[PDB]
Design a protein around this motif. Structure first.
Motif, PDB file in Angstrom:
ATOM      1  N   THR A 178      58.643  65.827 -51.882  1.00  8.91           N
ATOM      2  CA  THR A 178      59.583  66.854 -51.803  1.00  8.91           C
ATOM      3  C   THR A 178      60.513  66.810 -50.770  1.00  8.91           C
ATOM      4  N   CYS A 179      61.542  67.817 -50.780  1.00  8.75           N
ATOM      5  CA  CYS A 179      62.505  67.808 -49.759  1.00  8.75           C
ATOM      6  C   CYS A 179      61.927  68.702 -48.468  1.00  8.75           C
ATOM      7  N   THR A 180      61.181  69.595 -48.747  1.00  7.95           N
ATOM      8  CA  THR A 180      60.690  70.529 -47.820  1.00  7.95           C
ATOM      9  C   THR A 180      61.755  71.049 -47.183  1.00  7.95           C
ATOM     10  N   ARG A 189      69.111  72.912 -42.004  1.00  8.77           N
ATOM     11  CA  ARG A 189      68.557  71.501 -41.931  1.00  8.77           C
ATOM     12  C   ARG A 189      69.041  70.773 -43.105  1.00  8.77           C
ATOM     13  N   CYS A 190      69.288  71.400 -44.535  1.00  6.85           N
ATOM     14  CA  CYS A 190      69.843  70.620 -45.387  1.00  6.85           C
ATOM     15  C   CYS A 190      71.468  70.339 -45.181  1.00  6.85           C
ATOM     16  N   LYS A 191      72.418  71.254 -44.396  1.00  7.10           N
ATOM     17  CA  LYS A 191      73.556  71.184 -43.989  1.00  7.10           C
ATOM     18  C   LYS A 191      74.513  70.933 -45.433  1.00  7.10           C
ATOM     19  N   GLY A 247      70.319  76.257 -57.331  1.00 10.07           N
ATOM     20  CA  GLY A 247      69.222  75.862 -56.733  1.00 10.07           C
ATOM     21  C   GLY A 247      68.899  74.406 -56.494  1.00 10.07           C
ATOM     22  N   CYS A 248      68.261  74.146 -55.522  1.00 15.47           N
ATOM     23  CA  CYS A 248      67.775  72.576 -55.547  1.00 15.47           C
ATOM     24  C   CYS A 248      66.351  72.414 -55.684  1.00 15.47           C
ATOM     25  N   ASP A 249      66.076  71.460 -56.811  1.00 19.12           N
ATOM     26  CA  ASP A 249      64.696  71.180 -56.969  1.00 19.12           C
ATOM     27  C   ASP A 249      64.090  70.574 -55.716  1.00 19.12           C
ATOM     28  N   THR A 295      67.534  64.647 -57.648  1.00 20.29           N
ATOM     29  CA  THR A 295      68.001  65.767 -57.656  1.00 20.29           C
ATOM     30  C   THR A 295      69.115  66.065 -56.484  1.00 20.29           C
ATOM     31  N   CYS A 296      68.432  65.705 -55.176  1.00 20.40           N
ATOM     32  CA  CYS A 296      69.401  65.781 -53.984  1.00 20.40           C
ATOM     33  C   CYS A 296      70.765  65.005 -53.773  1.00 20.40           C
ATOM     34  N   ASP A 297      70.601  63.782 -54.464  1.00 22.50           N
ATOM     35  CA  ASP A 297      71.835  63.109 -54.392  1.00 22.50           C
ATOM     36  C   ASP A 297      72.722  62.925 -55.585  1.00 22.50           C
TER      37      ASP A 297
HETATM   38 FE   LIG Z   1      68.166  69.394 -50.453  1.00 24.24          FE
END
Ligand SMILES: [Fe+3]
Lengths: 136, 48, 336, 48
Positions: A9-11, A18-20, A100-102, A107-109
Protein backbone atom coordinates in the motif's frame (compact mmCIF):
# COMPACT_ATOMS: atom_id res chain seq x y z
CA UNK A 1 9.84 7.13 14.99
CA UNK A 2 10.09 4.23 12.55
CA UNK A 3 7.37 5.48 10.18
CA UNK A 4 8.54 3.16 7.40
CA UNK A 5 7.31 -0.20 6.11
CA UNK A 6 8.00 -2.09 2.88
CA UNK A 7 4.39 -3.00 2.11
CA UNK A 8 2.27 -2.87 -1.03
CA UNK A 9 0.00 0.00 0.00
CA UNK A 10 0.91 3.68 -0.24
CA UNK A 11 1.77 4.07 3.47
CA UNK A 12 0.88 7.77 3.22
CA UNK A 13 -2.18 9.70 4.38
CA UNK A 14 -3.81 11.45 1.44
CA UNK A 15 -2.78 15.10 1.44
CA UNK A 16 0.28 14.76 3.67
CA UNK A 17 3.58 16.42 2.78
CA UNK A 18 4.70 13.13 1.19
CA UNK A 19 1.73 12.56 -1.13
CA UNK A 20 1.94 16.17 -2.38
CA UNK A 21 -1.71 16.01 -3.51
CA UNK A 22 -3.80 19.19 -3.45
CA UNK A 23 -7.25 18.48 -2.01
CA UNK A 24 -8.64 22.01 -2.56
CA UNK A 25 -10.05 21.12 -6.03
CA UNK A 26 -11.76 18.09 -4.46
CA UNK A 27 -13.34 20.16 -1.67
CA UNK A 28 -17.14 19.84 -1.67
CA UNK A 29 -19.31 22.35 0.21
CA UNK A 30 -22.83 21.20 1.03
CA UNK A 31 -25.66 21.50 3.53
CA UNK A 32 -26.67 18.10 4.98
CA UNK A 33 -30.19 16.93 4.19
CA UNK A 34 -30.79 14.91 7.37
CA UNK A 35 -28.65 14.13 10.42
CA UNK A 36 -29.14 10.99 12.52
CA UNK A 37 -27.37 9.47 15.51
CA UNK A 38 -24.65 7.81 13.40
CA UNK A 39 -25.43 8.68 9.75
CA UNK A 40 -25.41 12.04 7.94
CA UNK A 41 -27.27 11.94 4.62
CA UNK A 42 -26.99 14.30 1.66
CA UNK A 43 -28.23 13.95 -1.90
CA UNK A 44 -25.31 15.78 -3.52
CA UNK A 45 -22.86 13.00 -2.64
CA UNK A 46 -25.38 10.48 -4.00
CA UNK A 47 -24.10 11.32 -7.48
CA UNK A 48 -20.66 9.86 -6.76
CA UNK A 49 -19.62 6.23 -7.01
CA UNK A 50 -19.83 4.16 -3.84
CA UNK A 51 -16.75 4.51 -1.67
CA UNK A 52 -15.66 7.78 -3.29
CA UNK A 53 -15.51 9.57 0.08
CA UNK A 54 -14.30 6.57 2.09
CA UNK A 55 -11.24 7.52 4.13
CA UNK A 56 -11.94 11.26 3.95
CA UNK A 57 -12.81 13.66 6.73
CA UNK A 58 -15.44 16.36 7.30
CA UNK A 59 -14.41 19.80 8.56
CA UNK A 60 -16.70 22.67 9.52
CA UNK A 61 -16.25 26.02 11.23
CA UNK A 62 -16.92 26.00 14.97
CA UNK A 63 -15.84 29.52 15.94
CA UNK A 64 -13.60 32.09 14.31
CA UNK A 65 -10.90 30.49 12.16
CA UNK A 66 -11.00 27.09 13.91
CA UNK A 67 -12.65 24.00 12.42
CA UNK A 68 -13.51 20.61 13.90
CA UNK A 69 -12.63 17.52 11.87
CA UNK A 70 -14.29 14.10 11.76
CA UNK A 71 -13.20 11.04 9.81
CA UNK A 72 -15.55 8.92 7.68
CA UNK A 73 -15.87 5.18 8.22
CA UNK A 74 -17.60 4.49 4.91
CA UNK A 75 -19.48 6.19 2.08
CA UNK A 76 -22.43 4.46 0.38
CA UNK A 77 -24.87 6.23 -1.90
CA UNK A 78 -26.44 9.25 -0.22
CA UNK A 79 -25.56 8.13 3.34
CA UNK A 80 -22.28 8.90 5.11
CA UNK A 81 -21.09 6.96 8.16
CA UNK A 82 -19.27 9.08 10.76
CA UNK A 83 -16.80 7.44 13.13
CA UNK A 84 -17.72 7.91 16.77
CA UNK A 85 -21.19 9.26 16.03
CA UNK A 86 -22.50 12.53 14.62
CA UNK A 87 -22.83 14.35 17.96
CA UNK A 88 -21.76 17.98 17.76
CA UNK A 89 -22.51 18.29 14.03
CA UNK A 90 -24.79 21.29 13.34
CA UNK A 91 -27.95 20.24 11.51
CA UNK A 92 -27.90 23.29 9.23
CA UNK A 93 -24.28 24.40 9.35
CA UNK A 94 -22.08 24.47 6.28
CA UNK A 95 -19.87 21.39 5.98
CA UNK A 96 -16.73 20.77 3.91
CA UNK A 97 -16.09 17.16 2.87
CA UNK A 98 -12.88 15.83 1.31
CA UNK A 99 -12.38 12.46 -0.43
CA UNK A 100 -10.14 9.63 0.72
CA UNK A 101 -7.39 7.57 -0.88
CA UNK A 102 -7.45 3.79 -0.53
CA UNK A 103 -3.67 3.67 -1.03
CA UNK A 104 -3.53 1.22 -3.94
CA UNK A 105 -1.40 2.26 -6.90
CA UNK A 106 -4.31 1.82 -9.30
CA UNK A 107 -6.46 3.91 -6.95
CA UNK A 108 -3.68 6.48 -6.60
CA UNK A 109 -3.15 7.03 -10.33
CA UNK A 110 -6.62 6.51 -11.82
CA UNK A 111 -8.27 8.93 -9.38
CA UNK A 112 -5.51 11.40 -8.47
CA UNK A 113 -2.82 10.70 -11.11
CA UNK A 114 -0.17 10.91 -8.37
CA UNK A 115 1.66 7.71 -9.32
CA UNK A 116 5.10 9.41 -9.52
CA UNK A 117 4.75 10.27 -5.82
CA UNK A 118 3.37 6.82 -4.96
CA UNK A 119 5.27 5.80 -1.82
CA UNK A 120 4.17 2.15 -1.95
CA UNK A 121 6.05 -0.86 -3.32
CA UNK A 122 3.58 -2.89 -5.37
CA UNK A 123 5.71 -5.50 -7.16
CA UNK A 124 9.39 -5.03 -6.32
CA UNK A 125 9.71 -8.10 -4.10
CA UNK A 126 7.62 -9.90 -1.51
CA UNK A 127 10.14 -12.33 -0.02
CA UNK A 128 12.92 -13.04 -2.56
CA UNK A 129 16.29 -13.06 -0.77
CA UNK A 130 19.73 -13.39 -2.33
CA UNK A 131 20.81 -15.83 0.41
CA UNK A 132 17.99 -18.36 0.33
CA UNK A 133 18.02 -22.11 -0.35
CA UNK A 134 16.78 -22.81 -3.91
CA UNK A 135 16.02 -20.06 -6.42
CA UNK A 136 13.62 -22.34 -8.32
CA UNK B 1 34.78 -43.30 -27.32
CA UNK B 2 36.87 -40.13 -27.19
CA UNK B 3 36.94 -36.78 -25.42
CA UNK B 4 33.61 -34.99 -26.08
CA UNK B 5 33.69 -31.93 -28.32
CA UNK B 6 32.82 -29.93 -25.20
CA UNK B 7 32.06 -30.63 -21.55
CA UNK B 8 29.54 -28.78 -19.37
CA UNK B 9 31.54 -28.38 -16.16
CA UNK B 10 29.38 -25.65 -14.62
CA UNK B 11 26.61 -23.12 -15.07
CA UNK B 12 26.73 -19.32 -14.87
CA UNK B 13 23.70 -17.87 -13.09
CA UNK B 14 22.29 -14.42 -13.87
CA UNK B 15 19.76 -12.64 -11.65
CA UNK B 16 18.19 -9.17 -11.69
CA UNK B 17 17.33 -7.96 -8.19
CA UNK B 18 15.80 -4.68 -7.01
CA UNK B 19 16.49 -3.66 -3.42
CA UNK B 20 16.40 -0.57 -1.21
CA UNK B 21 18.97 0.52 1.37
CA UNK B 22 16.44 2.52 3.42
CA UNK B 23 15.63 6.23 3.33
CA UNK B 24 17.54 8.84 1.33
CA UNK B 25 21.29 8.23 1.14
CA UNK B 26 24.04 10.62 0.09
CA UNK B 27 26.88 8.42 -1.19
CA UNK B 28 27.69 4.74 -1.69
CA UNK B 29 31.39 3.97 -1.24
CA UNK B 30 32.04 0.24 -1.67
CA UNK B 31 30.52 -3.23 -1.86
CA UNK B 32 32.05 -6.15 0.04
CA UNK B 33 31.03 -9.80 -0.32
CA UNK B 34 32.56 -12.87 1.34
CA UNK B 35 35.42 -10.76 2.68
CA UNK B 36 36.59 -9.64 -0.78
CA UNK B 37 36.33 -6.04 -2.00
CA UNK B 38 34.19 -6.36 -5.12
CA UNK B 39 34.01 -2.63 -5.90
CA UNK B 40 35.31 0.57 -4.32
CA UNK B 41 34.58 4.15 -5.34
CA UNK B 42 32.04 6.91 -4.91
CA UNK B 43 28.82 8.01 -6.64
CA UNK B 44 26.70 11.02 -5.68
CA UNK B 45 24.08 11.08 -8.46
CA UNK B 46 21.70 8.62 -10.08
CA UNK B 47 23.62 6.66 -12.67
CA UNK B 48 25.30 3.44 -13.72
CA UNK C 1 -13.07 -1.45 5.83
CA UNK C 2 -11.78 0.92 3.18
CA UNK C 3 -8.22 -0.21 2.52
CA UNK C 4 -7.64 -3.35 0.47
CA UNK C 5 -4.62 -5.70 0.48
CA UNK C 6 -2.71 -5.79 -2.82
CA UNK C 7 -1.24 -8.99 -4.30
CA UNK C 8 2.48 -8.60 -3.54
CA UNK C 9 3.71 -11.88 -2.08
CA UNK C 10 6.83 -13.67 -3.31
CA UNK C 11 6.15 -13.90 -7.07
CA UNK C 12 7.58 -17.42 -7.48
CA UNK C 13 9.73 -17.96 -10.58
CA UNK C 14 7.88 -19.62 -13.45
CA UNK C 15 10.29 -22.42 -14.34
CA UNK C 16 7.67 -24.90 -15.62
CA UNK C 17 9.86 -26.32 -18.42
CA UNK C 18 8.56 -25.77 -21.96
CA UNK C 19 9.28 -27.75 -25.10
CA UNK C 20 11.89 -26.43 -27.51
CA UNK C 21 10.38 -24.51 -30.43
CA UNK C 22 13.52 -23.85 -32.52
CA UNK C 23 15.85 -26.76 -33.31
CA UNK C 24 17.48 -28.68 -36.16
CA UNK C 25 19.25 -31.92 -37.03
CA UNK C 26 22.39 -32.16 -39.17
CA UNK C 27 25.03 -34.62 -40.35
CA UNK C 28 28.56 -34.03 -39.10
CA UNK C 29 30.95 -33.34 -42.01
CA UNK C 30 34.53 -34.59 -42.11
CA UNK C 31 35.78 -31.28 -40.68
CA UNK C 32 34.71 -32.02 -37.11
CA UNK C 33 35.58 -35.72 -37.21
CA UNK C 34 39.09 -34.76 -38.30
CA UNK C 35 39.58 -32.54 -35.25
CA UNK C 36 37.72 -34.66 -32.68
CA UNK C 37 38.76 -38.20 -33.66
CA UNK C 38 42.33 -39.45 -33.40
CA UNK C 39 44.02 -40.45 -36.69
CA UNK C 40 44.41 -44.10 -35.69
CA UNK C 41 40.66 -44.63 -35.34
CA UNK C 42 39.77 -42.16 -38.11
CA UNK C 43 41.78 -43.92 -40.82
CA UNK C 44 39.87 -47.16 -40.18
CA UNK C 45 36.53 -45.38 -40.71
CA UNK C 46 34.78 -46.54 -43.87
CA UNK C 47 33.49 -44.12 -46.50
CA UNK C 48 29.88 -44.93 -45.52
CA UNK C 49 30.23 -43.81 -41.89
CA UNK C 50 27.85 -41.09 -40.70
CA UNK C 51 27.33 -39.18 -37.46
CA UNK C 52 24.32 -37.30 -36.10
CA UNK C 53 24.20 -33.93 -34.36
CA UNK C 54 21.44 -31.63 -33.11
CA UNK C 55 21.09 -27.92 -32.42
CA UNK C 56 18.52 -26.06 -30.33
CA UNK C 57 17.59 -22.64 -28.97
CA UNK C 58 16.78 -21.90 -25.34
CA UNK C 59 13.03 -21.28 -24.92
CA UNK C 60 13.48 -19.48 -21.59
CA UNK C 61 16.35 -17.95 -19.64
CA UNK C 62 15.68 -20.42 -16.79
CA UNK C 63 16.76 -23.45 -18.86
CA UNK C 64 20.44 -24.41 -18.78
CA UNK C 65 20.63 -27.37 -21.18
CA UNK C 66 18.60 -30.06 -22.93
CA UNK C 67 18.78 -33.85 -23.16
CA UNK C 68 19.12 -35.76 -26.43
CA UNK C 69 16.90 -38.80 -27.05
CA UNK C 70 16.88 -40.83 -30.26
CA UNK C 71 16.02 -44.25 -31.67
CA UNK C 72 16.55 -46.18 -34.89
CA UNK C 73 13.58 -46.19 -37.22
CA UNK C 74 10.01 -45.51 -36.13
CA UNK C 75 9.95 -48.24 -33.46
CA UNK C 76 11.91 -48.97 -30.30
CA UNK C 77 12.74 -47.28 -27.02
CA UNK C 78 14.67 -44.02 -26.88
CA UNK C 79 18.18 -44.32 -25.45
CA UNK C 80 19.70 -41.28 -23.76
CA UNK C 81 22.71 -39.99 -25.70
CA UNK C 82 23.74 -36.96 -23.63
CA UNK C 83 23.10 -33.27 -23.12
CA UNK C 84 24.15 -30.20 -25.09
CA UNK C 85 24.22 -26.44 -24.71
CA UNK C 86 22.19 -23.87 -26.63
CA UNK C 87 23.42 -22.92 -30.09
CA UNK C 88 23.58 -19.17 -30.82
CA UNK C 89 21.45 -18.27 -33.83
CA UNK C 90 19.84 -15.37 -35.65
CA UNK C 91 17.59 -14.37 -38.53
CA UNK C 92 18.73 -12.76 -41.77
CA UNK C 93 17.18 -9.33 -42.29
CA UNK C 94 18.00 -9.27 -46.02
CA UNK C 95 18.57 -11.85 -48.72
CA UNK C 96 22.08 -13.25 -49.14
CA UNK C 97 23.06 -13.09 -52.84
CA UNK C 98 25.08 -15.76 -54.61
CA UNK C 99 28.60 -14.35 -54.34
CA UNK C 100 31.89 -15.81 -53.13
CA UNK C 101 34.08 -14.11 -50.56
CA UNK C 102 33.11 -12.09 -47.50
CA UNK C 103 29.61 -10.65 -47.37
CA UNK C 104 28.09 -8.23 -44.86
CA UNK C 105 24.73 -9.35 -43.46
CA UNK C 106 22.60 -7.91 -40.66
CA UNK C 107 20.98 -10.29 -38.18
CA UNK C 108 17.66 -9.81 -36.38
CA UNK C 109 16.42 -11.52 -33.21
CA UNK C 110 19.99 -12.66 -32.54
CA UNK C 111 20.49 -14.81 -29.44
CA UNK C 112 23.76 -15.24 -27.53
CA UNK C 113 25.50 -13.00 -30.05
CA UNK C 114 28.02 -12.01 -27.37
CA UNK C 115 29.47 -15.53 -27.07
CA UNK C 116 30.15 -15.83 -30.82
CA UNK C 117 33.84 -15.91 -31.76
CA UNK C 118 35.63 -15.27 -35.04
CA UNK C 119 36.76 -18.30 -37.03
CA UNK C 120 33.80 -20.45 -35.99
CA UNK C 121 31.88 -22.62 -38.44
CA UNK C 122 28.31 -21.47 -39.13
CA UNK C 123 25.72 -23.41 -41.14
CA UNK C 124 22.57 -22.00 -42.75
CA UNK C 125 20.13 -24.07 -44.80
CA UNK C 126 22.74 -26.34 -46.42
CA UNK C 127 25.73 -23.97 -46.68
CA UNK C 128 28.62 -23.80 -44.21
CA UNK C 129 30.20 -20.37 -43.76
CA UNK C 130 33.00 -18.82 -41.71
CA UNK C 131 32.61 -15.65 -39.66
CA UNK C 132 35.18 -12.93 -40.34
CA UNK C 133 33.96 -10.01 -38.20
CA UNK C 134 31.31 -9.40 -35.55
CA UNK C 135 29.44 -6.31 -34.36
CA UNK C 136 27.88 -6.94 -30.95
CA UNK C 137 25.64 -3.86 -30.82
CA UNK C 138 24.27 -3.90 -34.37
CA UNK C 139 24.46 -7.66 -34.95
CA UNK C 140 26.30 -7.28 -38.27
CA UNK C 141 28.73 -10.07 -39.17
CA UNK C 142 30.85 -10.92 -42.21
CA UNK C 143 30.42 -14.45 -43.57
CA UNK C 144 32.70 -16.32 -45.95
CA UNK C 145 30.61 -18.08 -48.60
CA UNK C 146 31.27 -21.56 -49.95
CA UNK C 147 33.42 -23.14 -47.24
CA UNK C 148 34.18 -26.74 -46.25
CA UNK C 149 31.97 -29.04 -48.39
CA UNK C 150 29.31 -26.50 -49.39
CA UNK C 151 28.59 -24.06 -52.22
CA UNK C 152 26.83 -20.70 -52.20
CA UNK C 153 23.06 -20.68 -52.64
CA UNK C 154 20.21 -18.20 -52.47
CA UNK C 155 18.87 -17.66 -48.94
CA UNK C 156 15.65 -15.68 -48.62
CA UNK C 157 15.06 -13.30 -45.73
CA UNK C 158 14.15 -15.18 -42.57
CA UNK C 159 16.62 -18.03 -42.99
CA UNK C 160 18.07 -19.29 -39.71
CA UNK C 161 21.83 -19.16 -39.10
CA UNK C 162 23.37 -21.61 -36.62
CA UNK C 163 26.84 -21.25 -35.10
CA UNK C 164 27.15 -24.94 -34.35
CA UNK C 165 30.91 -24.79 -33.73
CA UNK C 166 31.41 -25.90 -30.10
CA UNK C 167 27.64 -25.72 -29.48
CA UNK C 168 26.31 -29.03 -30.86
CA UNK C 169 24.94 -32.17 -29.22
CA UNK C 170 26.58 -35.24 -30.77
CA UNK C 171 25.61 -38.90 -30.51
CA UNK C 172 28.80 -40.97 -30.39
CA UNK C 173 27.17 -44.06 -31.91
CA UNK C 174 28.02 -44.73 -35.56
CA UNK C 175 25.12 -45.15 -38.00
CA UNK C 176 25.26 -46.35 -41.59
CA UNK C 177 23.88 -44.34 -44.50
CA UNK C 178 20.23 -44.68 -45.46
CA UNK C 179 18.86 -45.20 -41.94
CA UNK C 180 16.01 -42.97 -40.74
CA UNK C 181 16.07 -41.80 -37.12
CA UNK C 182 13.50 -40.27 -34.77
CA UNK C 183 14.90 -38.01 -32.06
CA UNK C 184 13.52 -35.59 -29.49
CA UNK C 185 15.05 -32.82 -27.40
CA UNK C 186 14.05 -32.53 -23.73
CA UNK C 187 14.64 -29.28 -21.86
CA UNK C 188 16.38 -29.38 -18.48
CA UNK C 189 15.86 -26.91 -15.63
CA UNK C 190 16.59 -26.74 -11.92
CA UNK C 191 12.96 -27.78 -11.36
CA UNK C 192 13.50 -31.01 -13.32
CA UNK C 193 13.31 -32.41 -16.83
CA UNK C 194 10.64 -31.96 -19.49
CA UNK C 195 8.22 -34.85 -19.82
CA UNK C 196 8.81 -36.65 -23.15
CA UNK C 197 5.12 -36.52 -24.07
CA UNK C 198 5.41 -32.77 -24.69
CA UNK C 199 8.61 -32.98 -26.78
CA UNK C 200 8.47 -32.39 -30.52
CA UNK C 201 9.51 -35.19 -32.88
CA UNK C 202 11.56 -35.06 -36.07
CA UNK C 203 13.16 -37.38 -38.61
CA UNK C 204 16.34 -37.26 -40.69
CA UNK C 205 17.75 -39.42 -43.49
CA UNK C 206 21.49 -40.05 -43.42
CA UNK C 207 23.46 -39.57 -46.63
CA UNK C 208 27.11 -40.27 -45.74
CA UNK C 209 28.00 -36.59 -45.84
CA UNK C 210 31.55 -37.20 -44.62
CA UNK C 211 32.07 -39.91 -47.23
CA UNK C 212 31.32 -37.82 -50.30
CA UNK C 213 34.24 -35.81 -51.73
CA UNK C 214 34.29 -32.04 -51.52
CA UNK C 215 33.11 -30.15 -54.63
CA UNK C 216 35.40 -27.84 -56.61
CA UNK C 217 36.27 -24.51 -55.03
CA UNK C 218 37.09 -21.33 -56.94
CA UNK C 219 34.51 -21.32 -59.76
CA UNK C 220 35.48 -18.46 -62.08
CA UNK C 221 34.27 -18.16 -65.68
CA UNK C 222 36.38 -16.06 -68.06
CA UNK C 223 37.83 -14.29 -65.03
CA UNK C 224 34.37 -13.52 -63.59
CA UNK C 225 32.48 -15.20 -60.76
CA UNK C 226 28.94 -16.23 -61.71
CA UNK C 227 28.83 -13.99 -64.81
CA UNK C 228 25.77 -13.54 -66.99
CA UNK C 229 27.88 -11.99 -69.79
CA UNK C 230 30.63 -13.84 -71.67
CA UNK C 231 32.11 -12.59 -74.96
CA UNK C 232 32.47 -15.67 -77.13
CA UNK C 233 35.14 -18.14 -76.04
CA UNK C 234 34.11 -20.06 -72.93
CA UNK C 235 36.69 -20.55 -70.17
CA UNK C 236 35.76 -22.21 -66.87
CA UNK C 237 38.17 -22.58 -63.95
CA UNK C 238 37.75 -24.82 -60.91
CA UNK C 239 39.79 -25.67 -57.83
CA UNK C 240 40.75 -29.11 -56.51
CA UNK C 241 39.89 -29.84 -52.87
CA UNK C 242 41.21 -32.75 -50.81
CA UNK C 243 39.28 -33.37 -47.60
CA UNK C 244 42.12 -35.23 -45.88
CA UNK C 245 44.65 -32.44 -46.39
CA UNK C 246 42.32 -29.67 -45.25
CA UNK C 247 41.39 -31.58 -42.06
CA UNK C 248 39.73 -29.07 -39.67
CA UNK C 249 40.71 -25.91 -41.58
CA UNK C 250 37.95 -23.85 -43.19
CA UNK C 251 38.95 -22.84 -46.73
CA UNK C 252 36.59 -20.76 -48.85
CA UNK C 253 36.26 -20.68 -52.64
CA UNK C 254 38.55 -17.66 -53.11
CA UNK C 255 41.61 -19.72 -52.11
CA UNK C 256 43.67 -21.41 -54.80
CA UNK C 257 44.33 -25.08 -55.39
CA UNK C 258 45.07 -27.25 -52.35
CA UNK C 259 45.97 -30.34 -54.36
CA UNK C 260 43.74 -33.26 -55.37
CA UNK C 261 42.64 -36.31 -53.41
CA UNK C 262 43.80 -39.86 -54.06
CA UNK C 263 41.52 -41.24 -56.77
CA UNK C 264 39.39 -38.08 -56.95
CA UNK C 265 38.53 -36.52 -60.31
CA UNK C 266 36.19 -33.84 -61.68
CA UNK C 267 33.10 -34.41 -63.82
CA UNK C 268 31.17 -31.81 -65.81
CA UNK C 269 27.71 -32.07 -67.36
CA UNK C 270 26.63 -29.87 -70.28
CA UNK C 271 22.90 -29.25 -70.75
CA UNK C 272 20.77 -27.32 -73.23
CA UNK C 273 18.64 -25.76 -70.49
CA UNK C 274 16.52 -28.87 -69.97
CA UNK C 275 18.18 -31.61 -72.03
CA UNK C 276 21.58 -33.24 -71.55
CA UNK C 277 23.80 -32.89 -74.63
CA UNK C 278 27.43 -33.46 -73.58
CA UNK C 279 29.12 -34.90 -70.50
CA UNK C 280 32.85 -34.73 -69.76
CA UNK C 281 34.22 -36.95 -66.99
CA UNK C 282 37.65 -37.71 -65.62
CA UNK C 283 38.77 -34.08 -65.72
CA UNK C 284 42.05 -33.57 -63.86
CA UNK C 285 43.07 -30.08 -65.02
CA UNK C 286 42.01 -26.74 -63.51
CA UNK C 287 40.27 -25.43 -66.64
CA UNK C 288 38.10 -26.70 -69.48
CA UNK C 289 37.09 -25.22 -72.84
CA UNK C 290 34.22 -26.26 -75.08
CA UNK C 291 35.79 -28.07 -78.06
CA UNK C 292 35.14 -26.47 -81.43
CA UNK C 293 33.96 -29.84 -82.78
CA UNK C 294 30.61 -29.76 -80.96
CA UNK C 295 29.95 -26.03 -81.46
CA UNK C 296 28.41 -26.54 -84.90
CA UNK C 297 26.72 -29.81 -83.95
CA UNK C 298 24.96 -28.23 -80.97
CA UNK C 299 25.00 -24.84 -82.71
CA UNK C 300 24.74 -21.62 -80.70
CA UNK C 301 23.65 -22.17 -77.10
CA UNK C 302 22.53 -18.76 -75.86
CA UNK C 303 21.15 -20.38 -72.69
CA UNK C 304 23.83 -22.69 -71.27
CA UNK C 305 23.56 -24.57 -67.97
CA UNK C 306 26.86 -25.36 -66.25
CA UNK C 307 26.91 -28.22 -63.73
CA UNK C 308 30.11 -28.95 -61.79
CA UNK C 309 30.78 -31.71 -59.28
CA UNK C 310 33.53 -34.01 -58.03
CA UNK C 311 33.30 -37.81 -58.25
CA UNK C 312 35.53 -40.60 -56.96
CA UNK C 313 34.75 -44.31 -57.31
CA UNK C 314 31.25 -43.33 -58.42
CA UNK C 315 30.63 -41.19 -55.32
CA UNK C 316 29.10 -37.83 -56.24
CA UNK C 317 29.39 -34.79 -54.00
CA UNK C 318 26.34 -33.91 -51.92
CA UNK C 319 26.17 -30.38 -53.36
CA UNK C 320 27.03 -29.02 -56.79
CA UNK C 321 27.17 -25.85 -58.85
CA UNK C 322 24.37 -25.00 -61.26
CA UNK C 323 23.77 -21.73 -63.14
CA UNK C 324 22.30 -20.78 -66.51
CA UNK C 325 24.57 -18.27 -68.27
CA UNK C 326 23.93 -16.10 -71.32
CA UNK C 327 26.44 -15.84 -74.17
CA UNK C 328 27.23 -12.73 -76.20
CA UNK C 329 29.49 -12.03 -79.15
CA UNK C 330 29.51 -12.58 -82.89
CA UNK C 331 26.84 -15.08 -83.83
CA UNK C 332 25.27 -14.79 -80.36
CA UNK C 333 22.34 -12.42 -79.76
CA UNK C 334 22.17 -10.41 -82.96
CA UNK C 335 18.40 -10.18 -82.81
CA UNK C 336 19.82 -7.16 -81.07
CA UNK D 1 42.63 -45.10 -22.46
CA UNK D 2 39.00 -44.56 -23.40
CA UNK D 3 35.74 -43.40 -21.85
CA UNK D 4 35.01 -45.59 -18.79
CA UNK D 5 32.09 -48.01 -19.04
CA UNK D 6 30.37 -45.82 -16.44
CA UNK D 7 31.20 -42.72 -14.40
CA UNK D 8 30.12 -42.03 -10.81
CA UNK D 9 29.11 -38.38 -11.08
CA UNK D 10 27.10 -38.23 -7.85
CA UNK D 11 25.48 -40.11 -4.99
CA UNK D 12 21.81 -40.40 -4.04
CA UNK D 13 21.27 -40.21 -0.28
CA UNK D 14 18.38 -41.97 1.49
CA UNK D 15 17.39 -41.23 5.09
CA UNK D 16 14.51 -42.38 7.31
CA UNK D 17 13.55 -39.73 9.87
CA UNK D 18 10.83 -39.74 12.53
CA UNK D 19 9.60 -36.35 13.73
CA UNK D 20 6.63 -34.82 15.53
CA UNK D 21 4.80 -31.60 14.69
CA UNK D 22 3.58 -31.04 18.26
CA UNK D 23 0.27 -31.96 19.87
CA UNK D 24 -2.75 -33.35 18.03
CA UNK D 25 -3.24 -31.92 14.54
CA UNK D 26 -6.31 -32.09 12.31
CA UNK D 27 -5.01 -31.80 8.75
CA UNK D 28 -1.71 -31.41 6.89
CA UNK D 29 -2.06 -29.41 3.68
CA UNK D 30 1.33 -29.02 1.98
CA UNK D 31 5.10 -29.33 2.33
CA UNK D 32 7.42 -26.58 1.07
CA UNK D 33 11.22 -26.82 0.87
CA UNK D 34 13.69 -24.27 -0.53
CA UNK D 35 10.81 -22.20 -1.90
CA UNK D 36 9.46 -25.01 -4.11
CA UNK D 37 6.11 -26.71 -3.49
CA UNK D 38 7.09 -30.35 -3.04
CA UNK D 39 3.58 -31.64 -2.27
CA UNK D 40 0.11 -30.14 -1.91
CA UNK D 41 -3.08 -31.84 -0.80
CA UNK D 42 -5.00 -32.87 2.30
CA UNK D 43 -5.08 -35.89 4.63
CA UNK D 44 -7.37 -36.29 7.65
CA UNK D 45 -6.62 -39.87 8.74
CA UNK D 46 -3.55 -41.95 9.49
CA UNK D 47 -2.19 -43.25 6.22
CA UNK D 48 0.42 -43.07 3.49
FE1 LIG E 1 -1.79 8.59 -2.40
Amino acid sequence: GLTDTYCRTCTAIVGDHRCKVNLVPYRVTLTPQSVSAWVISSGVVAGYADGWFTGGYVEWQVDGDNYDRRFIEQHAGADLHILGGTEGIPAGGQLRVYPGCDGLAQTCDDKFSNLPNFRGFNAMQGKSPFDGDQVW
Amino acid sequence: GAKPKAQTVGWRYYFDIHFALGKKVDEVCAIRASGKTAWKGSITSNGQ
Amino acid sequence: TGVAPPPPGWTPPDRTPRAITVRRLIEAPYRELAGVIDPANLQLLDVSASYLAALAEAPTSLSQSYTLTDRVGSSGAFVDRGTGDWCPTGLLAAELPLAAGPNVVTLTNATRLEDVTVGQAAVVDDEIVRVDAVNYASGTVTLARGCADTVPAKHLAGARVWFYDTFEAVDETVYSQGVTLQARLLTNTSEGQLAPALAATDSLTLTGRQGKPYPPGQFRINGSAYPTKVYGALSVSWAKRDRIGQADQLIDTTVGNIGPEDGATVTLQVYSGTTLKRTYAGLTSSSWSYPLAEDMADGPLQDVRLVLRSVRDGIDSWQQHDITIERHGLGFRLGE
